Design a protein around this ligand. Structure first.
Ligand SMILES: O=c1nc2n(C3CCCC3)c3cc(C4CCNCC4)ccc3n2c2cccc(Br)c12
Ligand SMILES: [Zn+2]
Ligand SMILES: [Zn+2]
Length: 113
């Protein structure tokens, strides 16, 4: 049966909150994470990261009704942030941005659900 309207509305609002988020410096943290690096330019990314995912793919899964619960969506957002932390150095801007986006996802979920 189709996802109920409440679930659909919740996923769009949560992902939009994460993608649109700007820190105290005015920087949109999601920017680098929208699209994966190219397989031709950065093959080492695909050698180390077993399940690559980006926000474009998460938005595709939301659009095509693939997530059946908020937990399903959370699993992919957490995977994206975990991959950023696996590939990139601890303490780097991209590693630290992914930790902030995990927090933004959780806070947005608490406000809509
Ligand atoms: O884990 C990630 N790490 C990175 N990096 C790092 C590799 C090393 C540098 C940062 C990216 C770098 C790019 C360049 C390409 C060429 N033009 C500039 C930007 C593009 C996407 C990148 N990207 C992700 C994109 C989506 C999801 C995840 Br979870 C990641
Ligand atoms: Zn549809
Ligand atoms: Zn794990």
């Amino acid at each position: 049966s189709p996802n109920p309207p409440k679930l659909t509305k919740q996923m769009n609002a949560i992902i939009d909150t994460v993608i649109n988020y700007k820190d105290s410096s005015g920087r949109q943290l999601s920017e680098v994470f929208i699209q994966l690096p190219s397989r031709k330019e950065l093959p080492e990314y695909y050698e180390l990261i077993r399940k690559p995912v980006d926000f474009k793919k998460i938005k595709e899964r939301i659009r095509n009704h693939k997530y059946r619960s908020l937990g399903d969506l959370e699993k992919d957002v957490m995977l994206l942030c975990h991959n950023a932390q696996t590939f990139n150095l601890e303490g780097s801007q991209i590693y630290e941005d992914s930790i902030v986006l995990q927090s933004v996802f959780k806070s947005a979920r608490q406000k809509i659900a």
